[PDB]
């Protein structure tokens, strides 16, 4: 009966599968799930020839980022507990700050995991785990946590610096409202449609600003994935509302330079004056910083299960949870290359770092991609 | 009859002996009603006489009764307390 | 349409509610005047109008 | 200007002067072009005028209006399992319905609200699309198009602030489902925030019992996962600590019954805090003092949480109230029957104190009534007086009406017709009459019994059954075992308690066996009576007048009178005889039906119906074989046909019937099978042991409106009838029917529909261990 | 299954499917007017034949539903007297209108929970409308419905004489007593509460209620 009951919405799959820079992987190291069906903040890292990627239940794996071959392992699957061996279940992405790799479990346990071997250099449980990747900077571990609490910890023992409630939504409205740090203030948005700024070195609100609508009397969408962590250029700060409603505003006051309160725009990088975006229906678009004025758009991957866009090999690089990788022009605006390097597929970030291109699929995690 | 078990005659609506100590001739109806409230029987045609009468058959060993009537005047003030037993 | 050549403008079961007389009221002894009138029995009598029961017009 | 006339164009559903009364430009008013423009917006502010075009010719107005009533259709298109009117209530929450007005400016907002309706239930994945057509002379439409994709599906709960207990073990205690295994499919995994709140209180009780007086829930947060389905949950709790229930400090208006209370509040001091049992024990006094007269036993417990030793101290604070509440009762609606039998099952009587429990025992034989579609109550306290209440029992009565008939074997044999009608003490008498009479070409019948079960005060229910039978076996008029019995018998009921209902009586079982068929265990009873007949003819004759004497014990302890679920009821009937009978025997059969629920809402409840037996004499006699026990094709037995499980009618070589035509009546007859043949008929035994275990199961498609007597039931009927006196001396080639391990096994299903024409049970059954001489009927259409 | 007509035409189909006799057709065009045309000034008259023709297939309470459709939607009308009389008449036939009493046993034990409300309606008819065509006939109903509750209560007074709450004997009489001074049932339960007094040894209070009986011998 139920193999035919559902009125699901069709994606525009992939017009113009391209290869002008003929894309291919440099290895295939499926470390493993990873993601699967389990939606998590855990995103890989491509750094120092040490693949700081992880699985959600099992072994910590450092791979050499030249071949995908393993440098070391531990397993921070917590060896016993209530039942046994306690799958990792990370509430945060991979944060590697110094010799400590700060990844927060959904046991609210972030650990100063050694870049050397994975030793917990110190451990700390927090007041509820994270909806963001834990922002470890400036002597602090700024964690946008699930209870709306911005629980800044020490990065030396986990001594909790300050813990205040953020722009808290009606439930866990899932959004990475990670406080990016700039000019002394930690700018944190909020999963309740508003935005804010907070003095980073003491946890004190510079301002908190309502932007747009959210759940509760003006309810918003359930399927869209909004980057509520701003890519912060100089104090004209460019940030989304939680229903993707972009707004250019001051850091120190929040005064709106311009805004894109017109849609649940998904993900973004600030390319100087080329604001590249993903629409809520997974329609790609370029915009500018002087007003969101379009350079180009793309509806080839409409409703496709895309990741956040990155810029590498002079093209907009992105993955999807169908395991396709896409290369769209910096300018207009269609496919320059396309690679379906996976089929389990990417929910986490395509890491256009290290002069390379690392990913994490649902099981087919660690490949480095070339063109 | 020569029967061992019998479904009973039953009632309640009575007073404890403390409630008989709660009452005295000269009390108002209200003075009864502050402690014993309204009766389940008052006197409609004549005076303000209250009643708290109890009945019981204990399964064919006879049938018993407690007739607790409370004779009042017209002024609502207690005039006679007849706590009449069974039979 | 279907009956014992009956049952079109009439009552099912029995019609006991018309054929009786008013209830034979009582003449109380002197002094024993209970409030037996104490019910809701504001039933005022007036000679208007119309028939009774089955014979009463039903448009 | 001052207007001469106003033109009211196009209204057709609302009154025309209602447009004038709403007009501030009315006739006789100084009417200006500002108020003309004000009439445009204000009749738009009526919401009913699809356009308001106020103009005037110098002074005489024309307000040319299209109207936007009548909303004629609100078409709900796309909601497959979602019923249409629950969206219409949100449409009604917008002030919009059939007959209203349809302002097409406000489309998407209530579309957002109906998506907010879709949001709230467990979906969001549906657009809505209001389609409006105009219709004759005014009317407008609302076709609403639903894009019903998917719902919010439970992914995960996380209980943060929990320290000792697994999240997953609480899932097994919970109602929110993130787990249905493929070999444990026992449910479905969807959201509702009340299953949230209940599982909070499940956990709240789950920490109330273990000790955690310091337990609280901080909050909980569903991950609004970006997939329009994903429900990952954090549950912010504060487990606190296993504190100790170390003393009960009961106090208040204790009314001199604290020992009765302390019987309830027997705790262990130093026991870990179990406020769940306190939550029970706090109720128990409100039964107990509610029994004691106190209609409002205002009771406040307090766990005085003593953190100094991590204990709690159970303060209780009691306000008792008044006692003598039961002044009078009201009923509601027994329009087929009597109130006084409902009053005689309402033993809560007036001129008493409040037995709150005694109120409810009045409803137990209302529950043992059978004529109840609910036993349901309105308890109105008579105001101004705490000695006065008037409970107005608002119920739903149960329905009547049934007739059925069977067919065959007629229209080739003589005219077979059976009479008898049923309307249930007859449609509300309390004093019932049982009537039968029928005839085929072989018999003429006259059957009567009268019953007054409800003249009495005890619970005595006598039935004296009188009968004349013309049993003839009109083959020629003979030739196939006549068995005639006419006279009188009695059965009974009673109290010893109000559960007890003593069934007993007298008998005149005047059995005149003539022209008997030669099966051997027919002569099992006839060896005790001393007949020396012809062993191969059917002219033989045996006459007894079994002056039988019934006694038993009906411990009528079964929940409902139509659908019971707990307890242990007997409905027993048997007989022994005294010096004075033709047969100094005993006939005992026994039934056993204990009901205990596993499902506490009782949708899953066992159903018992077995039949036992052990029959013999008090020295020198035996139970007769027309009173033998016949199993298969019956209530307790399925899988075998009518009168099949048992000891067997093992025929002798029938050679003469005194009528046997050209090759008929195969009773191991002369005309075929001239032999001592164990044939296909069960003679029955003196020791029965047969059973059926059945089960209450609901259906997730049958409407609850009438499902109180719709049920699916399953069985495995296991057992045999044996005969402790079935001798192996004559039965050399015939099986040992004295063994309890002749155990026939048949298993199957009942598929019951509430048919308003009587019980129609079409039962499927499979005789896996189908013993000797048993027939098979897998599609049994028997009862 | 009925389409739209001119607004003066559906009256005839209401009028003449009322003249069919198969009762599943009459309401079918009675209702077919006021749905398409509720704005007619005669739609409340359509209710008058509706409450009328609702009775016919033992489908009663839509009459009471259409009785209140006359009331609240329409403030000023004299035909509430019909609506008030059909109110109790709907309220009565729920109690005792079956033909199961065809063999010599009537139905006062059958509980008049709605013919409780029939007394409410007929009391408001005789006070709401004095000279209307239904005031006299409802007054005939107000006589017995009082006693219809009485013998119902007297059955309980018999039942309390049966079971033995002799206090609850006299109250079941007293509930019958204080409301109405007219029934013969008031006369005959008057020794039973006094038989209750005689069993409760209130023989004088029995005699005092027999003193009430004494002048009531008329």
Curated annotation (Swiss-Prot), chain B:
It is found in: Cell outer membrane. Keywords: Cell outer membrane, Lipoprotein, Membrane, Palmitate, Signal. It is a lipid-anchor. The chain holds residues 24 to 110 of 113 of the full protein. Its main location: membrane. The lineage of its organism: Bacteria, Pseudomonadati, Pseudomonadota, Gammaproteobacteria, Enterobacterales. Disulfide bonds: none annotated. Belongs to the BamE family. GO terms for molecular function: protein-macromolecule adaptor activity. It comes from Escherichia coli O6:H1 (strain CFT073 / ATCC 700928 / UPEC). GO terms for cellular component: Bam protein complex. It comes from the Bacteria. This is Outer membrane protein assembly factor BamE. One of its GO terms (biological process) is Gram-negative-bacterium-type cell outer membrane assembly. The gene is bamE.
UniProtKB/Swiss-Prot annotation, chain D:
It is found in: Cell outer membrane. Keywords: Cell outer membrane, Membrane, Repeat, Signal, Transmembrane, Transmembrane beta strand. Its main location: membrane. Part of the Bam complex, which is composed of the outer membrane protein BamA, and four lipoproteins BamB, BamC, BamD and BamE. GO terms for biological process: Gram-negative-bacterium-type cell outer membrane assembly; protein insertion into membrane. Residues 1-68, 69-149, 152-240, 243-321, 324-398 form the POTRA domain. GO terms for cellular component: Bam protein complex. HAMAP family: OM_assembly_BamA. It comes from Escherichia coli O45:K1 (strain S88 / ExPEC). Belongs to the BamA family. The gene is bamA. This is Outer membrane protein assembly factor BamA. The keyword RNA-binding does not apply. Part of the outer membrane protein assembly complex, which is involved in assembly and insertion of beta-barrel proteins into the outer membrane. Constitutes, with BamD, the core component of the assembly machinery. PROSITE patterns: POTRA.
From Swiss-Prot, chain E:
PROSITE patterns: PROKAR_LIPOPROTEIN. The lineage of its organism: Bacteria, Pseudomonadati, Pseudomonadota, Gammaproteobacteria, Enterobacterales. HAMAP family: OM_assembly_BamD. InterPro entries: BamD, BamD-like, TPR-like_helical_dom_sf. The gene is bamD. Part of the outer membrane protein assembly complex, which is involved in assembly and insertion of beta-barrel proteins into the outer membrane. Constitutes, with BamA, the core component of the assembly machinery. Belongs to the BamD family. Pfam families: YfiO. GO terms for cellular component: Bam protein complex. The keyword Membrane applies. The keyword Membrane applies. Part of the Bam complex, which is composed of the outer membrane protein BamA, and four lipoproteins BamB, BamC, BamD and BamE. Keywords: Cell outer membrane, Lipoprotein, Membrane, Palmitate, Signal. GO terms for biological process: Gram-negative-bacterium-type cell outer membrane assembly; protein insertion into membrane. This is Outer membrane protein assembly factor BamD. Its main location: membrane. It is found in: Cell outer membrane. Gene3D superfamilies: Tetratricopeptide repeat domain. It is a lipid-anchor.
């Amino acid at each position: 009966l139920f193999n035919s009951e559902e009125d699901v919405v069709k994606m525009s799959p992939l017009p113009t599968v391209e290869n002008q820079f003929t894309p291919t992987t440099a290895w295939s190291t499926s470390v493993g799930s990873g993601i699967g069906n389990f939606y998590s903040n855990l995103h890989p890292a491509l750094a120092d020839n040490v693949v700081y990627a992880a699985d959600r239940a099992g072994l910590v794996k450092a791979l050499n980022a030249d071949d995908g071959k393993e440098i070391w392992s531990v397993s921070l699957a917590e060896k016993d507990g209530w039942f046994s061996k306690e799958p990792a279940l990370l509430s945060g992405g991979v944060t590697v700050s110094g010799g400590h790799v700060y990844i927060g479990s959904e046991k609210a346990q972030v650990y100063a995991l050694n870049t050397s071997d994975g030793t917990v250099a110190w451990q700390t449980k927090v007041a509820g785990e994270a909806l963001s990747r834990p922002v470890v900077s400036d002597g602090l571990v700024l964690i946008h946590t699930s209870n709306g609490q911005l629980q800044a910890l020490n990065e030396a023992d986990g001594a909790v610096k300050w813990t205040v409630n953020l722009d808290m939504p009606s439930l866990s409205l899932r959004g990475e409202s990670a406080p990016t740090t700039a000019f002394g203030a930690a700018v944190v948005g909020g999963d309740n449609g508003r935005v804010s700024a907070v003095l980073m070195e003491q946890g004190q609100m510079i301002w908190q600003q309502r932007i747009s609508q959210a759940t509760g009397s003006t309810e918003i969408d359930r399927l869209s994935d909004v980057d509520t962590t701003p890519v912060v250029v100089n104090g004209v700060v460019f940030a989304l509302a939680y229903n993707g409603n972009l707004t250019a505003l001051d850091l120190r006051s929040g005064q709106i330079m311009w805004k894109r309160e017109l849609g649940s725009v998904n993900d973004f990088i600030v390319d100087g004056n080329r604001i590249y975006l993903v629409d809520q229906n997974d329609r790609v678009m370029a915009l500018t910083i002087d007003g969101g004025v379009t350079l180009w758009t793309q509806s080839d991957l409409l409703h496709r299960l895309l990741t956040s866009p990155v810029l590498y090999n002079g093209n907009l690089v992105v993955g999807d949870s169908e395991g396709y990788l896409h290369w769209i022009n910096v300018e207009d605006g269609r496919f320059v290359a396309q690679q379906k390097v996976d089929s389990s597929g990417f929910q986490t970030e395509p890491v256009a770092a290290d002069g390379k291109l690392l990913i994490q699929a649902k099981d087919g995690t660690v490949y480095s991609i070339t063109r | 009859e020569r029967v061992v078990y019998r479904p009973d005659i039953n009632q309640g609506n009575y007073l404890t002996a403390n409630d008989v100590s709660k009452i005295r001739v000269g009390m108002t109806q209200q003075q009864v009603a502050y402690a014993l409230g309204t009766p389940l029987m008052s006197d409609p045609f004549g005076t303000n006489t209250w009643f708290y009468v109890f009945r019981q058959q204990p399964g064919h060993e006879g049938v018993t009764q407690q007739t607790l009537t409370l004779t009042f005047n017209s002024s609502g003030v207690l005039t006679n307390i007849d706590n009449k037993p069974a039979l | 349409c279907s009956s014992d050549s009956r049952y079109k403008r009439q009552v099912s079961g029995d019609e006991a509610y018309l054929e009786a007389a008013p209830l034979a009221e009582l003449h109380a002894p002197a002094g024993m005047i209970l409030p037996v009138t104490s019910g809701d029995y504001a039933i005022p009598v007036t000679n208007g109008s119309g028939a009774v029961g089955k014979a009463l017009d039903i448009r | 200007f001052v207007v001469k006339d106003i033109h009211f164009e196009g209204l057709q559903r609302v009154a025309v002067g209602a447009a004038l009364l709403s007009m501030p430009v009315r006739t006789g008013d100084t009417v200006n072009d500002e108020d003309i423009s004000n009439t445009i917006r204000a009749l738009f502010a009526t919401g009913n005028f699809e356009d308001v075009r106020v103009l005037r010719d110098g002074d005489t107005l024309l307000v040319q209006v299209k109207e936007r009533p009548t909303i004629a259709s609100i078409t709900f298109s796309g909601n497959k399992s979602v019923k249409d009117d629950m969206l219409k209530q949100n449409l009604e929450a917008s002030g919009v319905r059939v007959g209203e007005s349809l302002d097409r400016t406000t489309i998407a907002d209530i579309e957002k609200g109906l998506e907010d309706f879709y949001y709230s239930v467990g979906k969001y994945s549906a657009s809505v699309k209001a389609v409006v057509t105009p219709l004759p002379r005014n009317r407008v439409d609302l076709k609403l198009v639903f894009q019903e994709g998917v719902s919010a599906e439970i992914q995960q709960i996380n209980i943060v602030g929990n320290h000792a207990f697994t999240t997953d073990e609480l899932i097994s205690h919970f109602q929110l489902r993130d787990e249905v295994p493929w070999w444990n499919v026992v449910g479905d995994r969807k959201y509702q925030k009340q299953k949230l709140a209940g599982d909070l209180e499940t956990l709240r009780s789950y920490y109330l019992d273990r000790g955690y007086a310091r337990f609280n829930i901080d909050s909980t947060q569903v991950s609004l996962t970006p997939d329009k389905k994903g429900i990952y949950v954090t549950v912010n709790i504060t487990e606190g600590d296993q504190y100790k229930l170390s003393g009960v400090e009961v106090s208040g208006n204790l009314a001199g019954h604290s020992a009765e209370i302390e019987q309830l509040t027997k705790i262990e001091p130093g026991e870990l805090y179990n406020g769940t049992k306190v939550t029970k024990m706090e109720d128990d006094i409100k039964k107990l003092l509610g029994r004691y007269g106190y209609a409002y036993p205002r009771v406040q417990s307090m766990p005085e949480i003593n953190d100094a030793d991590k204990t709690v101290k159970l303060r209780v604070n009691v306000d008792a109230g008044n006692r003598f509440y039961v002044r009078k009762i009201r009923f509601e609606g027994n329009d087929t029957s009597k109130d006084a039998v409902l009053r005689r099952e309402m033993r809560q009587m007036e001129g008493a104190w409040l037995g709150s429990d005694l109120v409810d025992q009045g409803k137990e034989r209302l529950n043992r009534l059978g004529f109840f579609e609910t036993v349901d109550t309105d308890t109105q306290r008579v105001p101004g007086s705490p000695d006065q209440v008037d409970v107005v029992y608002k119920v739903k009565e149960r329905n009547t009406g049934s007739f059925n008939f069977g067919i065959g074997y007629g229209t080739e044999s003589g005219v077979s017709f059976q009479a008898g009608v049923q309307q249930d003490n007859w449609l509300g008498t309390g004093y019932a009459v049982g009537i039968n009479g029928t005839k085929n070409d072989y018999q003429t019948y006259a059957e009567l019994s009268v019953t007054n079960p409800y003249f009495t005060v005890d619970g005595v229910s006598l039935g004296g059954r009188l009968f004349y039978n013309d049993f003839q076996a009109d083959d020629a008029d003979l030739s196939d075992y006549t068995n005639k019995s006419y006279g009188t018998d009695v059965t009974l009921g009673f109290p010893i308690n109000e559960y007890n209902s003593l069934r007993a009586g007298l008998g005149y079982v005047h059995n005149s066996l003539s022209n008997m068929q030669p099966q051997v265990a027919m002569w099992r009873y006839l060896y005790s009576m001393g007949e020396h007949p012809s062993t191969s003819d059917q002219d033989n004759s045996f006459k007894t007048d079994d002056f039988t004497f019934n006694y038993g014990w009906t411990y009528n302890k079964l929940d409902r009178g139509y659908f019971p679920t707990d307890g242990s009821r007997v409905n027993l009937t048997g007989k022994v005889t005294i010096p004075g009978s033709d047969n100094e025997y005993y006939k005992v059969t026994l039934d056993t039906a204990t009901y205990v629920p596993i499902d506490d809402d009782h949708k899953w409840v066992v159903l018992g119906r077995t039949r036992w037996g052990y029959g013999d004499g008090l020295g020198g006699k035996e139970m007769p074989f027309y009173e033998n026990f016949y199993a298969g094709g019956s209530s307790t037995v399925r899988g075998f046909q009518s009168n099949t499980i048992g000891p067997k009618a093992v025929y002798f070589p029938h050679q003469a019937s005194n009528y046997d035509p050209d090759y008929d009546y195969e009773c191991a007859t002369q005309d075929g099978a001239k032999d001592l043949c164990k044939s296909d008929d069960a003679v029955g035994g003196n020791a029965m042991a047969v059973a059926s275990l059945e089960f209450i199961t609901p259906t997730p498609f049958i409407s609850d409106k009438y499902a109180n007597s719709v049920r699916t039931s399953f069985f495995w009927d296991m057992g045999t009838v044996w005969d402790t006196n079935w001798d192996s001396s004559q039965y050399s080639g015939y099986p040992d029917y004295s063994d309890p391990s002749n155990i026939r096994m048949s298993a199957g299903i009942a598929l019951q529909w509430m048919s308003p024409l009587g019980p129609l049970v079409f039962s499927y059954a499979q005789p896996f261990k189908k013993y000797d001489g048993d027939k098979a009927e897998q599609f049994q259409f028997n009862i | 299954e009925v389409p739209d007509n001119p607004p003066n035409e559906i009256y005839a189909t209401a009028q003449q499917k009322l003249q069919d006799g198969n009762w599943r057709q009459a309401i079918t065009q009675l209702e077919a007017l006021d749905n398409r045309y509720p704005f007619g000034p005669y739609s409340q008259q359509v209710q008058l034949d509706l409450i009328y023709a609702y009775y016919k297939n033992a489908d009663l309470p839509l009459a009471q539903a259409a009785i209140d459709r006359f009331i609240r939607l329409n403030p000023t009308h004299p035909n509430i007297d019909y609506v008030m009389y059909m109110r109790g008449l709907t309220n009565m036939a729920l109690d005792d209108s079956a033909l199961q009493g065809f063999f010599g046993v009537d139905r006062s034990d059958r509980d008049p929970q709605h013919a409780r409300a029939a007394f409410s309606d007929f009391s408001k008819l005789v006070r709401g409308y004095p000279n209307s065509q239904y005031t006299t006939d409802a007054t005939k109903r107000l006589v017995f419905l009082k006693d219809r509750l009485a013998k119902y209560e007297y059955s309980v007074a018999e039942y309390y004489t049966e079971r033995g709450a002799w206090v609850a004997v006299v109250n079941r009489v007293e509930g019958m007593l204080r409301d109405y001074p007219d029934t013969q049932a008031t006369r005959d339960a008057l020794p039973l509460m006094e038989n209750a007094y005689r069993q409760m040894q209130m023989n004088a209070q029995a005699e005092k209620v027999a003193k009430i009986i004494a002048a009531n011998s008329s």
